[PDB]
């Protein structure tokens, strides 16, 4: 997250860590068993973490449950990023408190100029590295379809939506993918991809969840 703040240890309670010997992005807790991120986060051998503020420091509130199966989307393509979902299912249920805590998912899409939250590890700088050890938020609006389709001509599908800045400065980043955009206490969106970070005119571009919720209850329904 590039411009954003320290959240507060585990403020975030959906937020989880996908750990791979290492966090190599984020996730959303959507029930007890089951969590939502990226399908470009696919890979094996997935530890889901949750309860995380400092992930290098084990700090008393963690839960470290391995992965039993993940389910990317049916029509995800990794060239274009559409349909950029992705399920995992944890082997045991998480024990849910007030710092492990699902987030529900959307009922309807949101808006273009709705206030959201997006958090995670990723990169705090636009330009050069720097890696947090504790969760970052940046508060952002949706922007408008006519907007972000201008931003990246040729890019953005009905399943995907901008939110940001335009000016630069505000954004998720690499290391954030994976992770929520949260709007008025709903699941609206997922980091997914953008031309750089923080970049002038060019938003983070985010899966537009609302689209998923049916296959989202379907899959888990049946697995
Ligand atoms: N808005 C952040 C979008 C995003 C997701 N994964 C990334 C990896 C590298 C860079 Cl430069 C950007 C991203
Ligand atoms: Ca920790």
Same mark, same amino acid.
């Given at each position: 997250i590039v411009g954003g703040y320290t959240c507060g240890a585990?403020?975030?309670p959906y937020q989880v860590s996908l750990n791979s010997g290492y966090h190599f992005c984020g996730g959303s807790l959507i029930n007890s068993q089951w969590v939502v991120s990226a399908a470009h986060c696919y890979k094996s051998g997935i530890q889901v973490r949750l309860g995380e503020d400092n992930i290098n420091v084990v700090e008393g509130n963690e839960q470290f449950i391995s992965a039993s199966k993940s389910i990317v989307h049916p029509s995800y393509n990794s060239n274009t990023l559409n349909n950029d979902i992705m399920l995992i299912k944890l082997k045991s249920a998480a024990s849910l408190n007030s710092r492990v805590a699902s987030i529900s998912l959307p009922t309807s899409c949101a808006s273009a100029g709705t206030q959201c939250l997006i958090s995670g590890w990723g990169n705090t700088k636009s330009s050069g590295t720097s890696y947090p050890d504790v969760l +970052?938020?940046? +508060? &952002?609006?949706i922007l408008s379809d006519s !907007?972000? +389709? !201008? &931003?990246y001509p040729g890019q953005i599908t009905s399943n995907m939506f901008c939110a940001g800045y335009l000016e630069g400065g505000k954004d998720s980043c690499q290391g954030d993918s994976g992770g929520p955009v949260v709007c008025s @206490? +709903?699941?609206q @969106?997922?980091?997914?991809?953008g031309s750089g970070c923080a970049q002038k005119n060019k938003p983070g571009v985010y899966t537009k969840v609302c689209n998923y919720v049916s296959w989202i209850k379907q899959t888990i329904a049946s697995n």
């Open positions: 585990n403020t975030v +970052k938020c940046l +508060k &952002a609006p !907007s972000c +389709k !201008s &931003a @206490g +709903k699941l @969106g997922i980091v997914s991809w």
